[PDB]
Amino acid sequence: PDREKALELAMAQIDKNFGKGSVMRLGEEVRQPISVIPTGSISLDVALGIGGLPRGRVIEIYGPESSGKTTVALHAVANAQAAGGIAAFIDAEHALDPEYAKKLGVDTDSLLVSQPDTGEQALEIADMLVRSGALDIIVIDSVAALVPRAEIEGHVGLQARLMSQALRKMTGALNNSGTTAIFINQLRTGGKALKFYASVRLDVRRIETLKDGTDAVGNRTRVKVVKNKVSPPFKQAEFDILYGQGISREGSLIDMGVEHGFIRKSGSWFTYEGEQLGQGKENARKFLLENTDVANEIEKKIKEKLGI
Numbered sequence: 001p002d003r004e005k006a007l008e009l010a011m012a013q014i015d016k017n018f019g020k021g022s023v024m025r026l027g028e029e030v031r032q033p034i035s036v037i038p039t040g041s042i043s044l045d046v047a048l049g050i051g052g053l054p055r056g057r058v059i060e061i062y063g064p065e066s067s068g069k070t071t072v073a074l075h076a077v078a079n080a081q082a083a084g085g086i087a088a089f090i091d092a093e094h095a096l097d098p099e100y101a102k103k104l105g106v107d108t109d110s111l112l113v114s115q116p117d118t119g120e121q122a123l124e125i126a127d128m129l130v131r132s133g134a135l136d137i138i139v140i141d142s143v144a145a146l147v148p149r150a151e152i153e154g155h156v157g158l159q160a161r162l163m164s165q166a167l168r169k170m171t172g173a174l175n176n177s178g179t180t181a182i183f184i185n186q187l188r189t190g191g192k193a194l195k196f197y198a199s200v201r202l203d204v205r206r207i208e209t210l211k212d213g214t215d216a217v218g219n220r221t222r223v224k225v226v227k228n229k230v231s232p233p234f235k236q237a238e239f240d241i242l243y244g245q246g247i248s249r250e251g252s253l254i255d256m257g258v259e260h261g262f263i264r265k266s267g268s269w270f271t272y273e274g275e276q277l278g279q280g281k282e283n284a285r286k287f288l289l290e291n292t293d294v295a296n297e298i299e300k301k302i303k304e305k306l307g308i
């Protein structure tokens, strides 16, 4: 009996008994499902190992206030609509700002918003909305907002039960309807289930503010995919979020362009194929915000260096 020859046997046996990736080898680069929703963050896309948030799965995005979570989600919503999709936003926080949303790429006019009254209602109308197999993506702002019917009237019970049940009924559905479900989870609750239901769990934290000059613009966010059942987990990804513009695609190409030698630094003087872009990230960002085919080439070049 041979070791490696006997590991892959059982290993492939466990998958056939529980799932596609119930046992992964962190090293694996394996990729054969595609159908992903770009998050608008290149580093994060590769970080997920499949280019984007899978489709037909529940996804958790947790983190503290002002971390970027909602932005990633809104970003997901855009790329989703852009390629002819329908997005439903079950709001229970009442924090959404259409101005900022549209400025990210979302089609607000055609965005379905619902402001459930009870937490049970939200999960009902959210499931109901999914079962119609028409939605591409659906985001539920605030797991913590989904408060049980009571407590809004006369320790005494549980909410994590409300979540459980809802997920159990809903998991099946969105799975064979190809509708991705983003659950915003702002905190540092009843998610004692979503942790096992989710096939992908994102951990967003605001690494540090972006100097820029006098005052600041946006922040630098770090996302650690602690759970990923489609690809190998524990991957990380950083990216900039300008305040008022959202995630910076441009800023992605650099942080990413240098980690792969496509762009070079001649002493805080970024350059590509001979010609230079500027002196200092913020400056080389602008350079790319003007010439787009130059970026379209670098962007094109990195999607070729890795899974596509």
Ligand SMILES: Nc1ncnc2c1ncn2[C@H]1C[C@H](O)[C@@H](COP(=O)(O)OP(=O)(O)OP(=O)(O)O)O1
Pocket (backbone or CB within 6 Å): 063, 064, 065, 066, 067, 068, 069, 070, 071, 072, 097, 100, 184, 186, 218, 219, 241, 242, 243, 244, 245
């Ligand atoms: N209304 C807005 N106007 C301008 N900039 C905004 C606005 N809302 C958010 N931003 C920018 C700056 C914020 O630091 C950044 C992150 O936004 P947000 O999507 O609010 O992150 P988040 O999901 O961690 O926060 P929250 O837990 O409140 O949902 O987006």
